[PDB]
Nucleic acid binder design. Structure first.
Length: 43
DNA sequence: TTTTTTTTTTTTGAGCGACTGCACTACAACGTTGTAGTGCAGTCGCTCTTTTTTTTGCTGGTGGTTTT
């Protein structure tokens, strides 16, 4: 846990859990950008 | 095979990016609280060119406009 990393990441993981329902969509969630190793290491 | 009427407009920009406000936790100052950093959402500016390039048969040839 970093100072830039807020404790509301479980809400983003719950939003990503509701995203995996069907593959008919085309646009992914913005919160996947929270799960990047280039962004998590800098935070 | 015939025939009738009639004068009212509307609608239209959206993605990119910043400003500002409220919530939310991390961490140091004085268990608790104030300050700092970030996320999310409502509100708002802005801005979207320029232009020009061509061969065509004067009557090419038994052709041909006009009055009773």
């Amino acid at each position: 846990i970093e100072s830039s990393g807020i404790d509301r990441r479980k809400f983003n993981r719950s939003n990503q859990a509701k995203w995996i329902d069907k593959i008919s969509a085309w646009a992914e969630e913005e919160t996947n950008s929270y799960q990047l190793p280039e962004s998590l290491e800098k935070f």
